[PDB]
């Protein structure tokens, strides 16, 4: 029934049912792993972390997953602080001068200086190089996040750390379709950097405002939309000169300088 409720996008109803199942079979690690993922979809971060902790104690073979997603949940708090203009994220790879105005714009937004923040973003965008490439086989002249607070920047979690990766530093990105429920929140990825470095990563798959301001459909990534505030919720969306591609429909992204 919980799977059915989830399919229908009835998150609260699903949560009710699943917690009753766990209460009935408290030693069942499979149910608690389901519950952690559902809690994460709903943005109940501390309760999600609680379930992970219990899973690690019930099944020591799940401990690597537990470490990975416990730190991923920690990163969502860091995410909030970065977009609130209160924290500088880790920057991956070669330094990019135009990242600084992007970050400063977040601070200026926080202080109600939206026009000045807009000016800094316009400058950052102008300075960031248009790098051609392809999404699978489909060419583009440039690519960015539909979120103007990022533009040509990818949010990543690497080794449990929240970071910004300028797309100009990226050679290729590979992802698969989401498979587990937690993949709607953090999509596993392989990244190769232009200067050679390669690493596995998690990609925060929804916009940061989704948990608080989105509806159930948004939290499940079944829509992308912009709030009256001007901020996006729902599934991450990439835009190019030629079209747009939602994250869960991306498989391979290659840049060719």
Interface ranges with other proteins (CB under 8 A): 125-126, 128, 130, 142, 144, 146, 148, 151-152, 221-226, 234-235, 237, 239, 244, 246, 248
Q: Residue 78 or 239: which CB sits closer to other proteins?
A: 239
Minimum Å gap between C-beta 142 and other proteins is 6
Q: Residue 197 or 243: which CB sits closer to other proteins?
A: 243
Other beta carbons within 10 Å of 96: 21
- Measured in whole angstroms, the distance separating CA 24 from the mean position of its chain's CA atoms is 33
Minimum Å gap between C-beta 249 and other proteins is 8
DSSP 88: P
Minimum Å gap between C-beta 33 and other proteins is 25
Q: Residue 63 or 130: which CB sits closer to other proteins?
A: 130
User: In the numeric block, which tokens belong to residue 68?
Assistant: 């990975």
On the CB side of 104, CA atoms within 13 Å amount to 15
Q: 3-state DSSP call for residue 204?
A: strand
Q: Residue 37 or 224: which CB sits closer to other proteins?
A: 224
Minimum Å gap between C-beta 95 and other proteins is 19
DSSP 89: P
Minimum Å gap between C-beta 130 and other proteins is 6
Q: Residue 48 or 187: which CB sits closer to other proteins?
A: 187
SS (H, E, C) 127-144: HCCCCCEEECCEEECCEE
Q: Which of 194, 205, 200, 203 is nearest to 131 (CA)?
A: 194
CA atoms of 47 and 97, how far apart (whole Å): 39
């Amino acid at each position: 029934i919980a799977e059915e409720l989830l399919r229908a996008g009835r998150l609260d109803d699903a949560l009710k049912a699943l917690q009753e199942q766990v209460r009935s079979q408290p030693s069942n690690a499979t149910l608690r792993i389901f519950l952690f993922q559902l809690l994460a979809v709903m943005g109940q971060w501390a309760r999600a972390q609680n379930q992970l902790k219990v899973v690690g104690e019930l099944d020591a073979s799940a401990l690597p997953m537990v470490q990975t997603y416990s730190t991923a949940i920690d990163c969502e708090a860091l995410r909030r602080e970065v977009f609130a203009g209160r924290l500088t994220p880790v920057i991956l790879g070669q330094p990019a001068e135009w990242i600084a105005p992007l970050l400063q714009a977040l601070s200026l937004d926080a202080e109600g200086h939206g026009e000045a923040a807009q000016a800094l973003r316009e400058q950052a965008f102008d300075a960031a190089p248009a790098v051609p490439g392809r999404i699978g086989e489909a060419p583009f002249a440039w690519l960015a996040d539909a979120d103007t607070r990022l533009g040509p920047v990818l949010e990543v979690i690497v080794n449990g750390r929240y970071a910004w990766l300028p797309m100009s530093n990226l050679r290729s990105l590979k992802v698969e379709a989401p498979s587990d429920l937690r993949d709607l929140v953090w999509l596993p990825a392989e990244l190769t950097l232009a200067n050679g470095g390669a690493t596995v990563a998690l990609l925060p798959a929804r916009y940061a405002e989704t948990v608080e301001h989105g509806d159930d459909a948004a939290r499940l990534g079944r829509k992308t939309e912009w709030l009256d505030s001007g901020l996006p919720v729902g599934q991450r969306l990439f835009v190019t000169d030629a079209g747009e591609t939602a994250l869960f429909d991306l498989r391979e992204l290659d840049f060719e300088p």
